[PDB]
Enzyme design. Sequence first.
Site, PDB file in Angstrom:
ATOM      1  N   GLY A 180       0.894  -1.189   0.122  1.00  0.00           N
ATOM      2  CA  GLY A 180      -0.026   0.059  -0.066  1.00  0.00           C
ATOM      3  C   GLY A 180       0.960   1.206   0.037  1.00  0.00           C
ATOM      4  N   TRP A 181       0.313   2.476  -0.352  1.00  0.00           N
ATOM      5  CA  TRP A 181       0.969   3.474  -0.217  1.00  0.00           C
ATOM      6  C   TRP A 181       1.863   3.932   1.115  1.00  0.00           C
ATOM      7  CZ3 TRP A 181       3.235   6.434  -3.314  1.00  0.00           C
ATOM      8  CH2 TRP A 181       3.536   7.939  -3.013  1.00  0.00           C
ATOM      9  N   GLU A 188       4.615   0.214  -3.529  1.00  0.00           N
ATOM     10  CA  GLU A 188       4.630   1.616  -3.744  1.00  0.00           C
ATOM     11  C   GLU A 188       5.608   2.253  -3.636  1.00  0.00           C
ATOM     12  OE1 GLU A 188       0.731   3.399  -3.712  1.00  0.00           O
ATOM     13  OE2 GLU A 188      -0.391   1.537  -3.884  1.00  0.00           O
ATOM     14  N   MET A 246      -3.690   1.368 -11.378  1.00  0.00           N
ATOM     15  CA  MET A 246      -4.399   2.216 -10.829  1.00  0.00           C
ATOM     16  C   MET A 246      -4.548   3.631 -11.450  1.00  0.00           C
ATOM     17  SD  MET A 246      -2.174   1.518  -7.015  1.00  0.00           S
ATOM     18  CE  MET A 246      -0.630   1.521  -7.633  1.00  0.00           C
TER      19      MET A 246
END
EC number: 3.2.1.14
Length: 365
Positions: free
Chosen positions: A77-78, A119, A189
């Site tokens: 995830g970010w 990420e 994304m």
Amino acid sequence: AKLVCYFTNWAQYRQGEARFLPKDLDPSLCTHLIYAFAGMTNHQLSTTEWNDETLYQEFNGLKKMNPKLKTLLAIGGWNFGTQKFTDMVATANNRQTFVNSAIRFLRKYSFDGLDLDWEYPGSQGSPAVDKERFTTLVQDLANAFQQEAQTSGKERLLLSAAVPAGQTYVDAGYEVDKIAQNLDFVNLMAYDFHGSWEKVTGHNSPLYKRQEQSGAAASLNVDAAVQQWLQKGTPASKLILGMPTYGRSFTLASSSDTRVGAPATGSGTPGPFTKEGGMLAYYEVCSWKGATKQRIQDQKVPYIFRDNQWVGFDDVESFKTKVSYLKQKGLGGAMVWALDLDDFAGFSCNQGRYPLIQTLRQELS
Ligand SMILES: C=NC1=N[C@@H]2[C@@H](O)[C@H](O[C@@H]3O[C@H](CO)[C@@H](O[C@@H]4O[C@H](CO)[C@@H](O)[C@@H](O)[C@H]4NC(C)=O)[C@@H](O)[C@H]3NC(C)=O)[C@@H](CO)[C@@H]2O1
């Protein structure tokens, strides 16, 4: 066609009607459900909430009501960072430690696959070496997954990855052609093209660019992102087009200039439920009477404003446009982030339960 939807294990903490748990899930809405997010501890897959095991079970238990549904666990995830990824793929012993834990973890909890969300390898503190180490990680997982299936005699575990749309990031860490051969599907994304981290209002997920855009600025739209992954070697059928059930807001320098591209003094007021300025759930954009909805004709997506608040978002219409666009491209389907932000219980938008994603399912099927 695939309809990959993301569940997030922190939506459970929102207040009131915004609270989201597995019981708010519809077993039939999507073809694939991905659980965000699982972390890493000592090079191994691990939980991130005090109740992930309970959730995991309810999440995957949904397959008892719909045996056609495929569930996956997303790692990263970010906000995860790059550190633990770069360190885990650094040594064989580590990669192998992770892989074996992934398998044992996924099987124990009844997950059908793993969705990689680093990420991103090749930036944000990731050495350009991680571009090829990522590819190796993918091959390792794919290989172990294939081998395990044969020994365990179960449906082979699926391998996917959430990938960036930016030209700069793909070049920096993705061996597209090579990973595509090992990824069952790629979750693109296609959003966050524009945000409050800029001085001017722009749409979060514009399908096409604005006439007045050129160069690198003209690539900040879905189509560019898509054409890019295809050209670099992604079979159109493995490319799943991501769409957001959230939009991005800005505070206008002046409510006299409300056009797209106008001066923004920063992020928009946080949403009462999402409470993260600069973004808003679809259901927060619904509770807006006395606002003004437009339509960026060139980009086929809406946006609304009221006083010094501007928010570019997606609606039932743009979702139909997008579902239609991917069809023409022969893409594998749609991806949505996240079940979580749609009006999952028809408590705000007056369009029923899961207005947006329901649109996706119906348009796709
Ligand atoms: C399809 N995959 C995919 N991955 C990217 C996600 O990371 C990103 O959504 C964002 O994810 C981060 C966590 O990585 C979220 O962070 C959470 O923000 C809330 C406030 O909104 C905060 O209270 C915490 O719960 C925090 N949790 C963690 C674990 O950091 C959000 O920032 C979330 N943003 C949005 C708009 O959903 C998506 C979309 O960019 C990408 O898609």
